[PDB]
Amino acid sequence: SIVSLLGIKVLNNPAKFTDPYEFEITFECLESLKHDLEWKLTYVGSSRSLDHDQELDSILVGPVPVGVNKFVFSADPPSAELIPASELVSVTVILLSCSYDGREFVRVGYYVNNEYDEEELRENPPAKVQVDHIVRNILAEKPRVTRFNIVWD
């Protein structure tokens, strides 16, 4: 496996629901590679009988510098217009993945909790959800990482 994840730091946590995600990603590339890396963030909500996902954002890195690389991936937040109110204030998941030439080789999953920023709203939640008061707390120190064996070059 030519590219490996050496560290992931969530820079802004907790944050407002509407704040972009800021991931400081450190990875190593052992050999020169022909193609691009794609980093992608996906939202997964489970409030329905089946899952409903939101692809949030993605960026390409290419060509891949050989050595140790550090950069910040700033990913757009979820669209609350697509999320039922009960799921806005529940535990959800985000998946941070990297693919090489379209082939996913690492996935970092996080639990995310969403709660109001004031005790009185937490215990007396308003009829209409107030997204401006929702704070998201990523469980960033317990990442659930999956690796996949891929063809490289």
Partner: antibody, heavy 117, light 106 residues
Framework: EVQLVESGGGLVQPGGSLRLSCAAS????????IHWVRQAPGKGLEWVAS????????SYADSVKGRFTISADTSKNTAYLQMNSLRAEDTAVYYC??????????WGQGTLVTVFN | QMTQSPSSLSASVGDRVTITCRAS??????VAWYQQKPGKAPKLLIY???SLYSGVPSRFSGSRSGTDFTLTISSLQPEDFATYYC?????????FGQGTKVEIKR
């Protein structure tokens, strides 16, 4: 080439202690989560403890919190379960397992912990 | 909590069987299925509720419907008679179901 090999099981009396070792082969423990899961004879699987990559953060089953500690030595590429204040309930085969996302892909053969009076 | 049912079932080669676990939360990423035979370590079958682990035969599948997670074996083969466990990896705790022993009819 991936392997996990548990050691350190043995006979111990209540109130005693044991330190289990999980020797990782084919991968670096610092980049994967590592988990201890136990099985009493003829009974089901019971999760004990988890440690997570990059930060060494930990989780514990309620019935072992304050008693067991999970850790990993990156230099030795080995995970540990320090088992303090052991009780009759703790007798089991203890498996070490590697995290695969939210699941567990590779399991060792287990080491037997036998509490006896 | 992960309530697994049935605790055992008897079936024939070629039978389609389903095993269900009822979770306290509906997050799909959190649920996995394992096989275990006497004297052997558990084996991963399904992860993230519905994804088949590499090398597992296609007759195994998993699905989620709300808080019900289901393992289906489309046609039991001789090597499939074993005990099956579901797992939920939650925010704070991992929970295993009590297991389902799949025994062979004669």
């Amino acid at each position: 080439e991936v392997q996990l090999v548990e050691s350190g099981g043995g006979l111990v009396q209540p109130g005693g202690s044991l330190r289990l070792s999980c020797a990782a082969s084919g991968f670096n423990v610092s980049y994967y989560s590592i988990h201890w899961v136990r099985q009493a004879p003829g009974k089901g699987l019971e999760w004990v403890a988890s440690i997570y990559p990059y930060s060494g953060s930990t989780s514990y089953a309620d019935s072992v919190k304050g008693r067991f500690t999970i850790s990993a030595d990156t230099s030795k590429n080995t995970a540990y379960l320090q088992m303090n204040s052991l009780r009759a309930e703790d007798t089991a085969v203890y498996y070490c397992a590697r995290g695969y996302g939210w699941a567990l892909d590779y399991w060792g053969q287990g080491t037997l912990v036998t509490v006896f009076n | 909590q992960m309530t697994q049912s049935p605790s055992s079932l008897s079936a024939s080669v070629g039978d389609r069987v389903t095993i269900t676990c009822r979770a306290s939360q509906s997050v799909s990423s959190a649920v996995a299925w394992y096989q275990q035979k006497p004297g052997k370590a558990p084996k991963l079958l399904i992860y993230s509720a519905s994804s088949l682990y590499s090398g597992v035969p296609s007759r195994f599948s998993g699905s989620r419907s709300g808080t019900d997670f289901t393992l289906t074996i489309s046609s039991l083969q001789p090597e499939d008679f074993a005990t099956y466990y579901c797992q939920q990896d939650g925010w704070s705790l991992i929970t295993f179901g009590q297991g389902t022993k799949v025994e062979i009819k004669r």
